[PDB]
């Protein structure tokens with residue numbers, strides 16, 4: 001019967017966009033199309049604009065509270081960013097969702113400065129994964145420097161003036177040597193990664209006792225059926241392959257050299273043997289820890305939103 | 310070094326205390342002494358009144374956010390209780406702290422109905438602990454029906470009109486058969502017990518993937534050094550033993566039959582072998598999951614309050 005979530009179907013969620021009227025400007029439409037050419041502006045208006053408005057109500061409540069607490073705390077303390085996390089399967093659309101929300105949240109005067117950090121950067125470099133026999137376990141708990149990731153969000157929630165994150169490139173399939181990103185007290189930080197709702201129980205080989213989620217204000221799990229995820233993963237793989245036709249520095253150039261059919265077979269096996277296993281064992285069991293679960297159907301169309309009561 | 314907690318200084322804490330007329334009548338003072346005869350009214354003035362005032366800021370902020378969200382989302386607006394949890398070592402004073410905060414929080418017109426549930430009630434009964442060889446592990450993760458405790462706070466955070474909890478009695482050292490406490494959508498529920506900051510990692514014999522903390526709005530860990538906890542545990546034990554001098558149906562009547570010196574040696578060994586081991590292995594490592602850490606000194610006086618930034 002009753003669950004910890006308010007549940008919206010698409011009709012009810014899209015109905016929210018008039019409760020408070022919002023409309024994209026030309027400049028914004030151009031950013032959004034630059035984030036993802038396949039992303040529907042209709043989908044932005046019906047789904048992501050209401051979601052950005054929902055989040056502004058949460059962020060605004062936090063800022064009002066902070067202003068009250070400053071009455072006795074005093075206004076000398078550090079600026080602490082509001083942290084939104086985005087979890088879900090490999091290839092469900094976390095990066096797209098994060099980039100879209102970054103663009104939309106940047107509107108509001110209360111919170112113009114929005115940073116985006118992906119947990120990919122906190123993977124151990126390939127040389128270390130190789131040393132440990134983990135090269136086909138990339139994305140599994142053992143492949144992350146999870147202590148460093150927890151320290152990064154901890155430091156942000158400690159009010160450090162700057163914190164630095166390592167960065168990964170899907171193009172070179174590795175952590176970028178000397179490519180670290182520095183953030184400086186943003187209003188919002190969006191942390192995107194499959195493992196953002198994981199905890200010490202997922203890392204029994206090297207446990208931690210305070211979790212990423214203990215430093216996150218609001219978490220979104222993007223959900224979809226396995227059959228869709230596989231299709232989206234394979235399609236994305238083929239787009240990276242296309243990108244590599246003329247980029248011999250892409251790791252995907254190895255696959256550009258193969259027939260499309262054989263590339264598809266490789267991508268299918270990577271999905272089945274690595275990412276699907278990761279989803280079932282490590283990602284999906286964390287879904288019910290999210291503040292909000294956003295479910296997708298064919299063509300990336302959101303068909304359900306569930307929000308913690 | 311900065312950490313995720315601000316530590317109140319005397320000017321900030323004074324400003325919190327002085328922010329309202331906290332208007333304690335003679336009858337209220339009498340009821341507070343009824344909670345614990347060794348409770349200092351000076352601690353109530355200097356510590357518990359301001360702590361409860363702090364909590365009201367958080368509770369009140371959450372009420373107004375709920376109201377904003379209800380109009381935006383078009384939902385009916387069922388009440389969801391605000392849940393405060395209180396963790397810490399055996400004998401640190403969780404129950405006294407919980408009962409004082411219950412009495413003080415209920416004085417605010419915005420949240421007059423405050424319930425208190427202890428996690429002791431969710432221990433497996435002695436009959437079950439005996440079946441599993443766990444009578445000397447009472448309070449350890451294996452001794453709790455943890456799934457049932459998570460379900461209780463989950464149901465509350467689902468808007469169920471009523472929820473039922475099993476109840477424990479320290480006087481018979483067991484779960485009261487058919488003694489269940491039913492709560493009905495209070496404004497606030499205080500959940501008191503040593504395990505409220507524990508998670509799936511602490512229960513590898515029977516894992517859960519959504520934690521008590523996932524249904525708790527604000528958590529307090531009451532902290533004190535080991536040497537004080539020990540003396541407080543022993544003094545309490547001796548007091549229960551004294552109470553049993555005239556009560557043969559008390560579980561502690563058993564210890565009233567011993568000599569005082571032997572009762573003391575027994576209490577000391579219970580501390581050292583059961584409750585202290587539990588503190589080090591299972592309780593203390595959860596401390597930094599708390600919204601607020603309240604540290605106690607000699608005579609139970611609070612000498613430090615740390616609050617998440």
Ligand SMILES: Nc1ncnc2c1ncn2[C@@H]1O[C@H](COP(=O)(O)OP(=O)(O)O)[C@@H](O)[C@H]1O
Pocket residue numbers: 036038039040043088089090091092093094095096097232233235236299300
């Ligand atoms: N809302 C969307 N509309 C259209 N395509 C999308 C959408 N979200 C994701 N995609 C596409 O699906 C694939 C996976 O998205 P991505 O953001 O790369 O996933 P993740 O970051 O979760 O691995 C990509 O090819 C991306 O272009």
Ligand SMILES: Nc1ncnc2c1ncn2[C@@H]1O[C@H](COP(=O)(O)OP(=O)(O)O)[C@@H](O)[C@H]1O
Pocket residue numbers: 345347348349352397398399400401402403404405406541542544545608609
């Ligand atoms: N604030 C306080 N002032 C005086 N005595 C206290 C205070 N808090 C707890 N105590 C005493 O310390 C002992 C432990 O407290 P209790 O509330 O039973 O601990 P817990 O519930 O954490 O096991 C008891 O003897 C109790 O009377």
Ligand SMILES: CC(C)(CO)[C@@H](O)C(=O)NCCC(=O)NCc1cccnc1
Pocket residue numbers: 090120137138139140173194251252270271274275
């Ligand atoms: C764990 C991630 C970093 C999360 O974003 C995922 O993208 C990944 O590389 N998973 C490992 C399996 C996979 O999809 N590898 C891609 C790949 C690419 C080129 C050659 N072999 C494999």
Ligand SMILES: CC(C)(CO)[C@@H](O)C(=O)NCCC(=O)NCc1cccnc1
Pocket residue numbers: 399429446447448449479503545546579580583584
């Ligand atoms: C685990 C608790 C239920 C925490 O609420 C604890 O009181 C307890 O029974 N610990 C087991 C060891 C113990 O101290 N047993 C006897 C005892 C029980 C209560 C007070 N003094 C002594």
